[PDB]
PDB file of all heavy atoms in Angstrom:
ATOM      1  N   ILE A   5     -50.954 -57.091-196.435  1.00 28.24           N
ATOM      2  CA  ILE A   5     -52.104 -57.808-196.261  1.00 28.24           C
ATOM      3  C   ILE A   5     -52.124 -59.096-196.960  1.00 28.24           C
ATOM      4  O   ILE A   5     -51.483 -59.300-198.117  1.00 28.24           O
ATOM      5  CB  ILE A   5     -53.316 -57.010-196.599  1.00 28.24           C
ATOM      6  CG1 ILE A   5     -53.378 -55.680-195.925  1.00 28.24           C
ATOM      7  CG2 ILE A   5     -54.735 -57.854-196.388  1.00 28.24           C
ATOM      8  CD1 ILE A   5     -54.655 -54.906-196.184  1.00 28.24           C
ATOM      9  N   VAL A   6     -52.817 -60.079-196.386  1.00 27.54           N
ATOM     10  CA  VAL A   6     -52.971 -61.406-196.953  1.00 27.54           C
ATOM     11  C   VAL A   6     -54.311 -61.461-197.586  1.00 27.54           C
ATOM     12  O   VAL A   6     -55.244 -60.978-197.086  1.00 27.54           O
ATOM     13  CB  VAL A   6     -52.999 -62.562-195.853  1.00 27.54           C
ATOM     14  CG1 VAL A   6     -53.355 -63.856-196.393  1.00 27.54           C
ATOM     15  CG2 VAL A   6     -51.628 -62.677-195.216  1.00 27.54           C
ATOM     16  N   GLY A   7     -54.319 -62.087-198.717  1.00 27.19           N
ATOM     17  CA  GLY A   7     -55.544 -62.399-199.396  1.00 27.19           C
ATOM     18  C   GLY A   7     -55.410 -63.162-200.554  1.00 27.19           C
ATOM     19  O   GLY A   7     -54.407 -63.291-201.018  1.00 27.19           O
ATOM     20  N   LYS A   8     -56.439 -63.597-201.103  1.00 26.59           N
ATOM     21  CA  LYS A   8     -56.588 -64.383-202.299  1.00 26.59           C
ATOM     22  C   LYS A   8     -57.445 -63.613-203.228  1.00 26.59           C
ATOM     23  O   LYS A   8     -58.506 -63.049-202.776  1.00 26.59           O
ATOM     24  CB  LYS A   8     -57.143 -65.821-202.045  1.00 26.59           C
ATOM     25  CG  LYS A   8     -57.261 -66.599-203.297  1.00 26.59           C
ATOM     26  CD  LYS A   8     -57.666 -68.012-202.911  1.00 26.59           C
ATOM     27  CE  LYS A   8     -56.623 -68.745-202.188  1.00 26.59           C
ATOM     28  NZ  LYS A   8     -57.043 -70.086-201.714  1.00 26.59           N
ATOM     29  N   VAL A   9     -57.154 -63.562-204.540  1.00 26.82           N
ATOM     30  CA  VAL A   9     -57.939 -62.951-205.584  1.00 26.82           C
ATOM     31  C   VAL A   9     -59.317 -63.609-205.524  1.00 26.82           C
ATOM     32  O   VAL A   9     -59.369 -64.780-205.897  1.00 26.82           O
ATOM     33  CB  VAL A   9     -57.277 -63.006-206.985  1.00 26.82           C
ATOM     34  CG1 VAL A   9     -58.181 -62.380-207.971  1.00 26.82           C
ATOM     35  CG2 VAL A   9     -55.877 -62.431-206.916  1.00 26.82           C
ATOM     36  N   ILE A  21     -60.790 -59.017-203.696  1.00 19.28           N
ATOM     37  CA  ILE A  21     -59.836 -59.916-202.889  1.00 19.28           C
ATOM     38  C   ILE A  21     -60.422 -60.213-201.549  1.00 19.28           C
ATOM     39  O   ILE A  21     -60.945 -59.324-200.874  1.00 19.28           O
ATOM     40  CB  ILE A  21     -58.435 -59.152-202.846  1.00 19.28           C
ATOM     41  CG1 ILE A  21     -57.908 -58.728-204.257  1.00 19.28           C
ATOM     42  CG2 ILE A  21     -57.480 -60.018-202.146  1.00 19.28           C
ATOM     43  CD1 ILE A  21     -56.632 -57.991-204.197  1.00 19.28           C
ATOM     44  N   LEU A  42     -48.384 -56.038-212.449  1.00 23.25           N
ATOM     45  CA  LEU A  42     -48.688 -57.449-212.166  1.00 23.25           C
ATOM     46  C   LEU A  42     -49.204 -57.951-213.582  1.00 23.25           C
ATOM     47  O   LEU A  42     -50.151 -57.439-214.081  1.00 23.25           O
ATOM     48  CB  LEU A  42     -49.768 -57.560-211.107  1.00 23.25           C
ATOM     49  CG  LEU A  42     -49.690 -58.654-210.094  1.00 23.25           C
ATOM     50  CD1 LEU A  42     -49.681 -60.011-210.824  1.00 23.25           C
ATOM     51  CD2 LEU A  42     -48.616 -58.516-209.194  1.00 23.25           C
ATOM     52  N   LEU A  45     -53.816 -61.852-213.165  1.00 25.15           N
ATOM     53  CA  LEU A  45     -54.472 -62.250-211.927  1.00 25.15           C
ATOM     54  C   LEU A  45     -55.745 -62.887-212.428  1.00 25.15           C
ATOM     55  O   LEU A  45     -56.371 -62.541-213.257  1.00 25.15           O
ATOM     56  CB  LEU A  45     -54.910 -61.014-211.107  1.00 25.15           C
ATOM     57  CG  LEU A  45     -53.846 -60.140-210.581  1.00 25.15           C
ATOM     58  CD1 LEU A  45     -54.435 -58.890-209.935  1.00 25.15           C
ATOM     59  CD2 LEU A  45     -52.972 -60.857-209.518  1.00 25.15           C
ATOM     60  N   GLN A  49     -55.156 -66.821-206.955  1.00 19.32           N
ATOM     61  CA  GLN A  49     -54.005 -66.220-206.680  1.00 19.32           C
ATOM     62  C   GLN A  49     -53.899 -65.641-205.244  1.00 19.32           C
ATOM     63  O   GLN A  49     -54.742 -64.845-204.972  1.00 19.32           O
ATOM     64  CB  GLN A  49     -53.571 -65.152-207.649  1.00 19.32           C
ATOM     65  CG  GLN A  49     -53.100 -65.657-208.920  1.00 19.32           C
ATOM     66  CD  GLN A  49     -51.500 -66.005-208.861  1.00 19.32           C
ATOM     67  OE1 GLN A  49     -50.782 -65.924-209.847  1.00 19.32           O
ATOM     68  NE2 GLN A  49     -51.053 -66.561-207.816  1.00 19.32           N
ATOM     69  N   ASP A  50     -52.916 -66.132-204.531  1.00 21.20           N
ATOM     70  CA  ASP A  50     -52.671 -65.417-203.222  1.00 21.20           C
ATOM     71  C   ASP A  50     -52.030 -64.008-203.579  1.00 21.20           C
ATOM     72  O   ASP A  50     -51.147 -63.951-204.435  1.00 21.20           O
ATOM     73  CB  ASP A  50     -51.588 -66.122-202.383  1.00 21.20           C
ATOM     74  CG  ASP A  50     -52.166 -67.503-201.815  1.00 21.20           C
ATOM     75  OD1 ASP A  50     -51.911 -68.514-202.457  1.00 21.20           O
ATOM     76  OD2 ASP A  50     -52.649 -67.497-200.705  1.00 21.20           O
ATOM     77  N   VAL A  51     -52.496 -63.062-202.933  1.00 19.00           N
ATOM     78  CA  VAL A  51     -52.041 -61.794-203.186  1.00 19.00           C
ATOM     79  C   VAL A  51     -51.784 -60.993-201.974  1.00 19.00           C
ATOM     80  O   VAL A  51     -52.561 -61.115-201.008  1.00 19.00           O
ATOM     81  CB  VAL A  51     -52.841 -61.083-204.292  1.00 19.00           C
ATOM     82  CG1 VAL A  51     -54.267 -60.716-203.721  1.00 19.00           C
ATOM     83  CG2 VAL A  51     -52.177 -59.714-204.805  1.00 19.00           C
ATOM     84  N   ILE A  52     -50.775 -60.251-201.980  1.00 19.61           N
ATOM     85  CA  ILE A  52     -50.236 -59.508-200.889  1.00 19.61           C
ATOM     86  C   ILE A  52     -50.351 -58.003-201.235  1.00 19.61           C
ATOM     87  O   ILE A  52     -49.758 -57.758-202.251  1.00 19.61           O
ATOM     88  CB  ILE A  52     -48.800 -59.903-200.506  1.00 19.61           C
ATOM     89  CG1 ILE A  52     -48.787 -61.353-200.448  1.00 19.61           C
ATOM     90  CG2 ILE A  52     -48.405 -59.150-199.257  1.00 19.61           C
ATOM     91  CD1 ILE A  52     -47.231 -61.918-200.310  1.00 19.61           C
ATOM     92  N   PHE A  53     -51.084 -57.325-200.479  1.00 18.75           N
ATOM     93  CA  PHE A  53     -51.429 -55.903-200.892  1.00 18.75           C
ATOM     94  C   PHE A  53     -51.419 -55.011-199.757  1.00 18.75           C
ATOM     95  O   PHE A  53     -51.167 -55.370-198.645  1.00 18.75           O
ATOM     96  CB  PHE A  53     -52.722 -55.836-201.613  1.00 18.75           C
ATOM     97  CG  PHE A  53     -53.973 -56.314-200.901  1.00 18.75           C
ATOM     98  CD1 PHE A  53     -54.733 -55.412-200.197  1.00 18.75           C
ATOM     99  CD2 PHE A  53     -54.283 -57.676-200.920  1.00 18.75           C
ATOM    100  CE1 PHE A  53     -55.788 -55.851-199.431  1.00 18.75           C
ATOM    101  CE2 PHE A  53     -55.372 -58.142-200.140  1.00 18.75           C
ATOM    102  CZ  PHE A  53     -56.088 -57.275-199.478  1.00 18.75           C
ATOM    103  N   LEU A  67     -49.947 -54.570-205.273  1.00 15.88           N
ATOM    104  CA  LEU A  67     -50.094 -56.000-205.310  1.00 15.88           C
ATOM    105  C   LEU A  67     -48.771 -56.706-205.490  1.00 15.88           C
ATOM    106  O   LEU A  67     -47.897 -56.233-206.189  1.00 15.88           O
ATOM    107  CB  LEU A  67     -51.063 -56.427-206.452  1.00 15.88           C
ATOM    108  CG  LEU A  67     -52.473 -55.879-206.400  1.00 15.88           C
ATOM    109  CD1 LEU A  67     -53.328 -56.649-207.260  1.00 15.88           C
ATOM    110  CD2 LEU A  67     -53.068 -55.883-204.958  1.00 15.88           C
ATOM    111  N   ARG A  68     -48.670 -57.848-204.809  1.00 16.39           N
ATOM    112  CA  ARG A  68     -47.568 -58.706-204.892  1.00 16.39           C
ATOM    113  C   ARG A  68     -48.141 -60.121-204.962  1.00 16.39           C
ATOM    114  O   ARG A  68     -48.961 -60.460-204.187  1.00 16.39           O
ATOM    115  CB  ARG A  68     -46.712 -58.528-203.734  1.00 16.39           C
ATOM    116  CG  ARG A  68     -45.351 -59.255-203.800  1.00 16.39           C
ATOM    117  CD  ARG A  68     -44.617 -58.556-204.904  1.00 16.39           C
ATOM    118  NE  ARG A  68     -44.264 -57.191-204.673  1.00 16.39           N
ATOM    119  CZ  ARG A  68     -43.727 -56.313-205.648  1.00 16.39           C
ATOM    120  NH1 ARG A  68     -43.479 -56.740-206.816  1.00 16.39           N
ATOM    121  NH2 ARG A  68     -43.656 -55.013-205.352  1.00 16.39           N
ATOM    122  N   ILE A  69     -47.688 -60.938-205.906  1.00 19.45           N
ATOM    123  CA  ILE A  69     -48.190 -62.244-206.071  1.00 19.45           C
ATOM    124  C   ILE A  69     -47.416 -63.269-205.302  1.00 19.45           C
ATOM    125  O   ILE A  69     -46.358 -63.825-205.659  1.00 19.45           O
ATOM    126  CB  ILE A  69     -48.594 -62.663-207.486  1.00 19.45           C
ATOM    127  CG1 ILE A  69     -47.510 -62.182-208.536  1.00 19.45           C
ATOM    128  CG2 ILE A  69     -49.857 -62.233-207.954  1.00 19.45           C
ATOM    129  CD1 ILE A  69     -46.089 -62.638-208.371  1.00 19.45           C
ATOM    130  N   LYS A  70     -48.011 -63.568-204.148  1.00 21.23           N
ATOM    131  CA  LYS A  70     -47.539 -64.657-203.270  1.00 21.23           C
ATOM    132  C   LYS A  70     -46.175 -64.804-203.029  1.00 21.23           C
ATOM    133  O   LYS A  70     -45.399 -65.536-203.750  1.00 21.23           O
ATOM    134  CB  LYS A  70     -48.124 -65.999-203.727  1.00 21.23           C
ATOM    135  CG  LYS A  70     -48.122 -67.175-202.893  1.00 21.23           C
ATOM    136  CD  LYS A  70     -48.577 -68.441-203.682  1.00 21.23           C
ATOM    137  CE  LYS A  70     -48.577 -69.721-202.793  1.00 21.23           C
ATOM    138  NZ  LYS A  70     -49.574 -69.530-201.653  1.00 21.23           N
TER     139      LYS A  70
END
Side-chain angles (χ1 to χ4, degrees):
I5 305 183
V6 173
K8 175 177 293 175
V9 181
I21 303 177
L42 219 303
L45 300 173
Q49 280 283 211
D50 293 89
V51 64
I52 307 169
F53 57 96
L67 304 192
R68 190 65 59 191
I69 39 64
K70 191 185 183 65

